[PDB]
Ligand binder design. Structure first.
Ligand SMILES: CC(=O)N[C@H]1[C@@H](O)[C@H](O)[C@@H](CO)O[C@@H]1O
Ligand SMILES: CC(=O)N[C@H]1[C@@H](O)[C@H](O)[C@@H](CO)O[C@@H]1O
Ligand SMILES: CC(=O)N[C@H]1[C@@H](O)[C@H](O)[C@@H](CO)O[C@@H]1O
Ligand SMILES: [Ca+2]
Ligand SMILES: [Ca+2]
Ligand SMILES: [Ca+2]
Ligand SMILES: [Ca+2]
Ligand SMILES: [Ca+2]
Ligand SMILES: [Ca+2]
Ligand SMILES: [Ca+2]
Ligand SMILES: [Ca+2]
Ligand SMILES: [Ca+2]
Lengths: 151, 151, 151
C-alpha cells in the first residue's frame, strides 16, 4: 500500500526523466551532431591533420567517423555540408598500400569512392576525406580536414 | 518484502541518474543555451536568412525561438547579448500583413516591440528580430540573423 | 503482485536510460569538456577578463575552474592545451594580498605555482592563470583569459 505509493512516485520520476532526456538529446545534437541507428557523429567544428584528429577522437572516448553504410554516410555528409568543410574518415591504407582498413585492422565493409579513387596521387595518399557530395577521396594524412568523431 | 528492497535499489539508481543528468544538463547549456521553465533555447552560434534558420531548427526537432512571456524573452535576450548578434524569432506576418503568427498559425500571446514597430519598412518586413536590448523589430526575411532554436 | 510487473518494467526503462545517457556523456564533452572524478570542466572557447568570466560561470550554475588536486589540474590542463590559451582560475588574493582563496573564502588546498610565483608583479596581480604546461601564475584580473567553468 505504501510500496504501491512509492512505485507510483518512482514511475513518475522515470517518466519525467524519459521526457527530459529526449529533450536534452535534441539540444545536444544541435547543431554539431547527427544520430543514425545506434551511432552518433559529432564535429569539433575545426580542422586538424589526421594524426591530431585521430587522437582527439580517441581521447574523447570515440573514434574518427567510420561510415559503414549508405545511411551512415548520408548522416555524416550532413555535418560536412553544414560546415562546408571536407572531413577525415578513420580509415587508412598506411599498413598495406591499396587496402583500406578501419583502426582495428578490419577491411572495409562499405565504400563511397569518387570516380577513379582511391588513386594514391603522388604515391602518398593514405587517408580518406569525405566531400560535401558524400563521395570519398584518398588524400595525404598531413592535410587539415574537419574533425568529426563517432560515439 | 524483497520487492520493497528492489524498489529501494531502483530508486537509488534513479536518484543517481537524476543527479548525473542535472549536472550534464548544466554543462550542456554553457555557454550557448538557456533554460526557462520547460523550454530550452540553444544558439547555433552563426547567422542565416530566415528560411535557412527555420529549416535548421525544424530538422533538429525544434522550432525557431518563440518567446511567449517576459520571462522567456529575457532568457532569449541573454543569448543574444552573449553573442552580441540580433536573432530571428519564429513568427511572421507572411499570410496576412500586420498579423504576426507562430508557425502553427496561432496569433501572438506576447510581444515586445520596440517603439515604432512593427512598421513593415519598405513594404516588406515579414520576419521578426530580437535585439540585444530584448526589444523586437520586424525585418526582411532575407536578412541574416543569429540562429536560435527552442526545444 | 502486479506491482512486481511494474518494478520489472521500470528496471527495463532505467537500463535503457542509463545506456543511452552513457553514450551522450561522451558526445557532450567532445571537444570542450573534461570529466575528472565527479567534476566537469567545460570551456566557453573564448577569452574574457576575470569579472566577466566569473559572472558567466556563476550565472550558468557553476563557478570558474578551481582545481583542488593534481589530477583536477591535469584535466584542466588538457582543455588549456587543446584551446592553446591560458585560462583563469577562480581564486584571488583580492581580499588580503598574498592570501589566495576560493570564491567561498576558503584557503587553497592545492597549488601549482610556477617558480617565483605568485609575485604580485607591478603590485597588482590578484587573479590566477594556468598555462599550457599546467603551472600557475598570478596575473592582473583585467587581462583576458580562456573561460573555463566547473560543474
Ligand atoms: C590525379 C588526380 O585526379 N588527383 C585528384 C585526387 O585524387 C587527389 O587526391 C588530389 C590531391 O590534391 O588532387 C585531385 O583532385
Ligand atoms: C522607419 C524606421 O525607423 N525603420 C527602422 C526599422 O523599423 C526597420 O526594420 C529598418 C529596416 O532596415 O530600418 C530601421 O532601422
Ligand atoms: C617579474 C616577472 O617574472 N613577471 C612574470 C609574471 O610573474 C607576471 O605575472 C607577468 C605579467 O605580464 O610578466 C611575467 O611573465
Ligand atoms: Ca602508402
Ligand atoms: Ca595509399
Ligand atoms: Ca586521391
Ligand atoms: Ca508582407
Ligand atoms: Ca509585414
Ligand atoms: Ca521594422
Ligand atoms: Ca592586491
Ligand atoms: Ca596579489
Ligand atoms: Ca605573476
Amino acid at each position: 500500500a505504501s510500496l504501491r505509493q512509492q512505485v507510483e512516485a518512482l514511475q513518475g520520476q522515470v517518466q519525467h526523466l524519459q521526457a527530459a532526456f529526449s529533450q536534452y538529446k535534441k539540444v545536444e545534437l544541435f547543431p554539431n551532431g547527427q544520430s543514425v541507428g545506434e551511432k552518433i557523429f559529432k564535429t569539433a567544428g575545426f580542422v586538424k591533420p589526421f594524426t591530431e584528429a585521430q587522437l582527439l577522437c580517441t581521447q574523447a572516448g570515440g573514434q574518427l567517423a567510420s561510415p559503414r553504410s549508405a545511411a551512415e554516410n548520408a548522416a555524416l555528409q550532413q555535418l560536412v555540408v553544414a560546415k562546408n568543410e571536407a572531413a577525415f574518415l578513420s580509415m587508412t591504407d598506411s599498413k598495406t598500400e591499396g587496402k583500406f582498413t578501419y583502426p582495428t585492422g578490419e577491411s572495409l565493409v562499405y565504400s563511397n569512392w569518387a570516380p577513379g579513387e582511391p588513386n594514391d596521387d603522388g604515391g602518398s595518399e593514405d587517408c580518406v576525406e569525405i566531400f560535401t557530395n558524400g563521395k570519398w577521396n584518398d588524400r595525404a594524412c598531413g592535410e587539415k580536414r574537419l574533425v568529426v568523431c563517432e560515439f
